[PDB]
């Protein structure tokens, strides 16, 4: 019940000294504790099992059926994850893919179609993502358009807090793993796109491994 952090970054997060995962994602820090995302976005995180997929390896005697679970996670206001876990039983696969999704959550940059008034509602620019054959293209749309999409990326983009978006998939989208990964690769690349908004030369703030370098020496081994 009482969480015990093993990594350096998890120890800072627990002690309320790094106070938002915006600060973690500024330094591209690998999150490997599951309870960092359960700490910050804990109440605004919702889980939907995209697919239970039975996979098999042919053995001396019959097949060894394991179950691959795709879980899409995210708060309906900034962040999405996509976790894939293969296990012998279905409950272990789901739970493991919830954890792997949480670890994997990324922030989505969201911009404006034309008029720049109120809160942002859409993808900031045309961003393609892919794995396998599946090429997914996310396109900025006007306010109230909804997510014009296939039901899988529609489910991730809802979870990303994107209200409005035009999609355009390509290749074998019927293979869900590739399609869910491709649309997750497409919203991954929103804060990896250099727009003119992001030209103001970088002011390098101090790392959480430097800001609290004197705290980490005593707080744990």
């Amino acid at each position: 019940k009482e969480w015990l952090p093993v990594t350096k970054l998890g120890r800072l997060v627990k002690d309320m000294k790094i106070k938002s995962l915006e600060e973690i994602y500024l330094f591209s820090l690998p999150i490997k504790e599951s309870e960092i995302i359960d700490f910050c976005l804990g109440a605004a995180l919702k889980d939907e099992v995209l697919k239970i997929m039975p996979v098999q390896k042919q053995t001396r005697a019959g097949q060894r059926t394991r179950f691959k679970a795709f879980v899409a996670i995210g708060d309906y206001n900034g962040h999405v994850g996509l976790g894939l876990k293969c296990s012998k039983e279905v409950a272990t696969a789901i739970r493991g893919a919830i954890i792997l999704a949480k670890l994997s959550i990324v922030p989505v940059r969201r911009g404006y179609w034309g008029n720049k008034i109120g809160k942002p509602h859409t993808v900031p620019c045309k961003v393609t993502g892919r794995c396998g054959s599946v090429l997914v293209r996310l396109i900025p749309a006007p306010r109230g358009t909804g997510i014009v999409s296939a039901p899988v990326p529609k489910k991730l983009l809802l979870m990303a807090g994107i209200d409005d978006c035009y999609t355009s998939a390509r290749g074998c989208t019927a293979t869900l793993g590739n399609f869910a990964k491709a649309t997750f690769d497409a919203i991954s690349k929103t804060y990896s796109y250099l727009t003119p908004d992001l030209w103001k030369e970088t002011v390098f703030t101090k790392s959480p491994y430097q800001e609290f370098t004197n705290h980490l020496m005593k707080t744990h081994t």
Partner: protein, 83 residues
Amino acid sequence: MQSNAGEFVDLYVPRKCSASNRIIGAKDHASIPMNVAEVDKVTGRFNGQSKTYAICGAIRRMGESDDSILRLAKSHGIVSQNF
């Protein structure tokens, strides 16, 4: 990233490689913000203030990460112009 009113609206301003000027994603785990210690020019001791250079994973696996820091330190007066 202002709206019409002027409010800064995006949820974090991502770092940007000092060598290539290309932004560093939330999961580019081969990035490196390297702090170079400064010198009291008469003494030759650590001041407490330091220069901070960020590099994206792409340049690090490209093998150009050392020559980038070499230019950045030379372009900061750390390394001699002669060199």
